[PDB]
Amino acid sequence: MDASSLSPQLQQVHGDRFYKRVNMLKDELREELTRVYRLHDYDLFFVQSVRVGLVILSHLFYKQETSLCLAKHAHYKPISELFNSSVPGSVPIITHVSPYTGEVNSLQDCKGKGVVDASHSFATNRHAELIAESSVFVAPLHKHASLTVGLAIVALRSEHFSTLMRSELRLFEESTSSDKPLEEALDNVRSHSWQPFNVAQVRPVEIKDAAGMDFCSISAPDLPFCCFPVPTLSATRQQQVKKAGATYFPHTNTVRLSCWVRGDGSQRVDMTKQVEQDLIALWEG
Amino acid sequence: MDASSLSPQLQQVHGDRFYKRVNMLKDELREELTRVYRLHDYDLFFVQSVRVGLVILSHLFYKQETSLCLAKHAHYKPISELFNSSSSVPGSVPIITHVSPYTGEVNSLQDCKGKGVVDASHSFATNRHAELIAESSVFVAPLHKHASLTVGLAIVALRSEHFSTLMRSELRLFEESTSSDKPLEEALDNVRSHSWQPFNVAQVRPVEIKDAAGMDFCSISAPDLPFCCFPVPTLSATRQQQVKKAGATYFPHTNTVRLSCWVRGDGSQRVDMTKQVEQDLIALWEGK
Numbered sequence: 001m002d003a004s005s006l007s008p009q010l011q012q013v014h015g016d017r018f019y020k021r022v023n024m025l026k027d028e029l030r031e032e033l034t035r036v037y038r039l040h041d042y043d044l045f046f047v048q049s050v051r052v053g054l055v056i057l058s059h060l061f062y063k064q065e066t067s068l069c070l071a072k073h074a075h076y077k078p079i080s081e082l083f084n085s086s087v088p089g090s091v092p093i094i095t096h097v098s099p100y101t102g103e104v105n106s107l108q109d110c111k112g113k114g115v116v117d118a119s120h121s122f123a124t125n126r127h128a129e130l131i132a133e134s135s136v137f138v139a140p141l142h143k144h145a146s147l148t149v150g151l152a153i154v155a156l157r158s159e160h161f162s163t164l165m166r167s168e169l170r171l172f173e174e175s176t177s178s179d180k181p182l183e184e185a186l187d188n189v190r191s192h193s194w195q196p197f198n199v200a201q202v203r204p205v206e207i208k209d210a211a212g213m214d215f216c217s218i219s220a221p222d223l224p225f226c227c228f229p230v231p232t233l234s235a236t237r238q239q240q241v242k243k244a245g246a247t248y249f250p251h252t253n254t255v256r257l258s259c260w261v262r263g264d265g266s267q268r269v270d271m272t273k274q275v276e277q278d279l280i281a282l283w284e285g
Numbered sequence: 286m287d288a289s290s291l292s293p294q295l296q297q298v299h300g301d302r303f304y305k306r307v308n309m310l311k312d313e314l315r316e317e318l319t320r321v322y323r324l325h326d327y328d329l330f331f332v333q334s335v336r337v338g339l340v341i342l343s344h345l346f347y348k349q350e351t352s353l354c355l356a357k358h359a360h361y362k363p364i365s366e367l368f369n370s371s372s373s374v375p376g377s378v379p380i381i382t383h384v385s386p387y388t389g390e391v392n393s394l395q396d397c398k399g400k401g402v403v404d405a406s407h408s409f410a411t412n413r414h415a416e417l418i419a420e421s422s423v424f425v426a427p428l429h430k431h432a433s434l435t436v437g438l439a440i441v442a443l444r445s446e447h448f449s450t451l452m453r454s455e456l457r458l459f460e461e462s463t464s465s466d467k468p469l470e471e472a473l474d475n476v477r478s479h480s481w482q483p484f485n486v487a488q489v490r491p492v493e494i495k496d497a498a499g500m501d502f503c504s505i506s507a508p509d510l511p512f513c514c515f516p517v518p519t520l521s522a523t524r525q526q527q528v529k530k531a532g533a534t535y536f537p538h539t540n541t542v543r544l545s546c547w548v549r550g551d552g553s554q555r556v557d558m559t560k561q562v563e564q565d566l567i568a569l570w571e572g573k
Contacts, residue, residue: 048333
């Protein structure tokens with residue numbers, strides 16, 4: 001290939017037909033993702049990440065005089081900052097499941113539209129609802145999908161978008177990207193040891209006596225993780241949280257405990273009691 | 286780390302400190318690039334690609350009631366489609382294509398108010414690098430062309446004194462969006478290697494071949510670029526196969542063929558490949 005299209009030294013390591021190879025790898029992964037996640041009703045587009053997908057969508061929506069703005073609920077902090085204060089038309093960004101409280105929101109507004117951040121529903125026990133009702137969603141592949149780092153999908157419900165709009169996103173998907181995320185995802189999706197879902201279900205937890213004191217989970221049931229109101233923590237507490245593999249969100253005053261059980265989706269695994277044990281243990285050494 | 290933050294299986298392969306490690310690799314590469322490419326006047330942000338950079342910029346500019354519009358000249362075709370409807374109120378900011386990939390034409394680096402976001406794909410890490418970094422307010426450069434670093438990584442460079450902390454903080458927060466470590470490691474490995482040199486120092490002056498295989502060729506590309514672009518007739522399947530076989534590129538939308546050179550150096554010495562291109566062009570039109 002012309003030296004001006006791709007460094008010759010890069011061609012040696014990534015292939016002298018690099019662009020076609022990445023297009024073919026995208027094609028392969030798109031077909032695997034469509035079958036395992038059952039995404040036949042969607043056109044899928046690869047983008048780097050959830051926030052990249054959102055900004056591409058914002059631009060394409062604005063080219064049709066439609067603005068993309070935040071729904072009135074909690075969103076991933078970086079997303080609520082990037083789209084704070086965002087002509088006539090309006091499509092809300094919907095956080096399906098909050099990473100901080102586990103709250104769950106409705107997948108469309110009052111007029112059937114909505115771009116869903118599916119980070120904590122894609123490839124979980126909530127995947128079927130996401131895919132039954134969403135017009136658009138955006139999902140990373142490094143969380144519950146357990147595929148790769150630095151790759152996400154934008155999924156457009158096919159009957160809902162014009163060929164024009166899908167064309168433009170397909171043309172944008174051609175923007176120079178690494179082959180490595182694609183090859184990792186493909187290696188994982190074709191692996192005998194990989195399974196598509198985190199099937200952990202955690203129901204409401206109330207351990208009303210951990211050092212005398214009360215914890216009461218606030219997260220939706222059947223998520224793979226569990227979020228509890230806490231006081232503002234000492235550093236000692238924060239060291240235990242971190243060491244335990246849980247997560248402190250100061251801005252919501254929650255800690256999140258999470259499970260990880262892989263399966264094919266046909267069977268959920270109740271891990272309620274394990275989170276309970278794990279909460280008491282964290283607050284007690 | 287929390288299984289909800291990053292797959293445990295992915296942690297096993299990339300590390301349980303993945304996000305911090307990627308941030309640290311970015312920090313290292315930003316210092317390496319600033320030194321080798323003399324970017325002390327700029328704040329650098331990593332993004333996937335030129336178009337991702339342009340889409341983020343377009344959002345951040347909108348949040349301050351500024352439009353990002355195409356300047357009136359030819360752009361990379363995907364870019365002219367992506368921004369085809371955007372616009373002109375003086376305050377708007379043009380996207381400028383420093384060096385066109387199709388003709389090698391060069392455009393001026395600023396608005397008549399000193400402004401503009403420059404697509405530097407064919408100037409970054411070439412003989413026009415010093416002009417780019419002397420003049421641009423903002424540029425966007427890929428790292429897989431003349432920089433020869435990696436695939437899947439580009440930089441947005443904001444002239445530091447031109448932008449508010451607030452806007453830079455937004456872009457820094459965007460650069461944190463989940464990305465692969467592999468483009469960063471490749472770039473860092475290249476930029477610190479003995480093998481690698483930072484610039485394509487090939488210089489091609491104007492080339493004119495009178496009547497070679499039935500026709501005359503006269504180059505249209507600005508001089509001192511590493512590549513050379515020539516008007517051509519709508520080509521035959523046969524002609525197009527020879528172009529591709531040769532490692533040249535046919536652009537039907539402009540009726541040009543591009544011939545390119547590739548000579549690596551540290552920038553202290555340019556290498557004139559004028560005579561090579563002319564010889565190569567006669568040869569392409571003879572099957573050899």
